[PDB]
Amino acid sequence: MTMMDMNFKYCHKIMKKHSKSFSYAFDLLPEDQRKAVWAIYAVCRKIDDSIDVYGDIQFLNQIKEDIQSIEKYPYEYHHFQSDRRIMMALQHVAQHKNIAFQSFYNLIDTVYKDQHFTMFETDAELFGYCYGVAGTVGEVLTPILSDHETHQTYDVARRLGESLQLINILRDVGEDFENERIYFSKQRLKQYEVDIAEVYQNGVNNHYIDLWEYYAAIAEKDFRDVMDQIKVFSIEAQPIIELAARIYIEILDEVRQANYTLHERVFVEKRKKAKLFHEINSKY
Numbered sequence: 001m002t003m004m005d006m007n008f009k010y011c012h013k014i015m016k017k018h019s020k021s022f023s024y025a026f027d028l029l030p031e032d033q034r035k036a037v038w039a040i041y042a043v044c045r046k047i048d049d050s051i052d053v054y055g056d057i058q059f060l061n062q063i064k065e066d067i068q069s070i071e072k073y074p075y076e077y078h079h080f081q082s083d084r085r086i087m088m089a090l091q092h093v094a095q096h097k098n099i100a101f102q103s104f105y106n107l108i109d110t111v112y113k114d115q116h117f118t119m120f121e122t123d124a125e126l127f128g129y130c131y132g133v134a135g136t137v138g139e140v141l142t143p144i145l146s147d148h149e150t151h152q153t154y155d156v157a158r159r160l161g162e163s164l165q166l167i168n169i170l171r172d173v174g175e176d177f178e179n180e181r182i183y184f185s186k187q188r189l190k191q192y193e194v195d196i197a198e199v200y201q202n203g204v205n206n207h208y209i210d211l212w213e214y215y216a217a218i219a220e221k222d223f224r225d226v227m228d229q230i231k232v233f234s235i236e237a238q239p240i241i242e243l244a245a246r247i248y249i250e251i252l253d254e255v256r257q258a259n260y261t262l263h264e265r266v267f268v269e270k271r272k273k274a275k276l277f278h279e280i281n282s283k284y
């Protein structure tokens with residue numbers, strides 16, 4: 001095993017550790033493509049944890065600096081200040097693919113501003129936040145999962161990631177409340193007459209369910225639109241991308257089955273992921 005192989009294997013470990021939902025799915029891709037995804041994931045994961053988990057704001061500045069170094073001198077050797085193995089894998093990927101560097105910068109700014117967390121006043125603010133933390137990952141992942149780097153591709157990728165961030169939000173309402181975060185907007189929260197602190201203490205009710213179902217309906221609808229343009233992706237990636245999404249559509253059925261509980265984190269069982277994959281491949 002070469003050194004670079006080792007760098008990608010460290011990225012793989014990080015994704016296996018933190019992505020209980022998607023590691024399984026993305027590892028089904030051909031080697032070159034899944035190695036790039038592990039790199040991207042590891043970069044995004046370090047960024048998202050820089051502050052949330054290590055509290056470390058200097059570390060986040062170093063990640064930005066490191067990405068900035070790769071963008072300007074893709075071919076020079078750099079003394080990476082954040083995590084060397086991840087940045088080497090990322091520079092290796094940038095020498096073969098067209099990395100949307102601005103998208104990592106948008107993600108970094110969105111993760112940063114999340115330390116001045118202020119509830120969204122409207123859905124448009126919530127949706128612009130889904131772009132920043134997940135539409136951007138769709139954009140950076142675009143040249144890896146497709147040979148047609150065109151606006152329709154970027155656009156389905158962006159729309160898929162924002163859509164998964166919404167499902168994510170619907171799965172994590174309760175744990176996000178414990179961390180003092182409510183991602184639903186005030187406009188919509190007032191309109192459905194819900195106070196999350198309250199529903200958290202006394203259980204679900206019918207206003208909360210309707211609020212939640214109002215957002216799940218937005219996510220499901222968007223899921224179906226990207227499932228009609230799944231062909232913008234490479235042929236090897238299409239069933240994986242579809243598996244990734246459906247796992248998350250599954251999580252919504254899991255929240256419904258646990259009666260929208262705010263006190264547990266529903267997940268999808270590995271065995272079930274393999275089933276979903278089997279069905280997708282039926283028509284693939």
Ligand SMILES: CC(C)=CCC/C(C)=C/CC/C(C)=C/CSP(=O)(O)OP(=O)(O)O
Nearest residue numbers: 018019020021134137138157161164165168
């Ligand atoms: C493929 C494509 C074109 C677009 C999709 C872009 C993606 C994958 C965006 C990320 C969406 C989110 C919120 C993922 C959870 S990461 P996690 O590791 O925390 O997952 P988990 O919390 O275990 O469910």
Ligand SMILES: CC(C)=CCC/C(C)=C/CC/C(C)=C/CSP(=O)(O)OP(=O)(O)O
Nearest residue numbers: 019022037041044045048133134137168172
């Ligand atoms: C899967 C893939 C290709 C890309 C994802 C890249 C990542 C990790 C981006 C950082 C922003 C996200 C989606 C964090 C997890 S949201 P959460 O509710 O799961 O909270 P968490 O940080 O996981 O505890």
Ligand SMILES: [Mg+2]
Nearest residue numbers: 018019020021
């Ligand atoms: Mg997670």
Ligand SMILES: [Mg+2]
Nearest residue numbers: 048049052053
């Ligand atoms: Mg996080």
Ligand SMILES: [Mg+2]
Nearest residue numbers: 168169172176
């Ligand atoms: Mg969450």
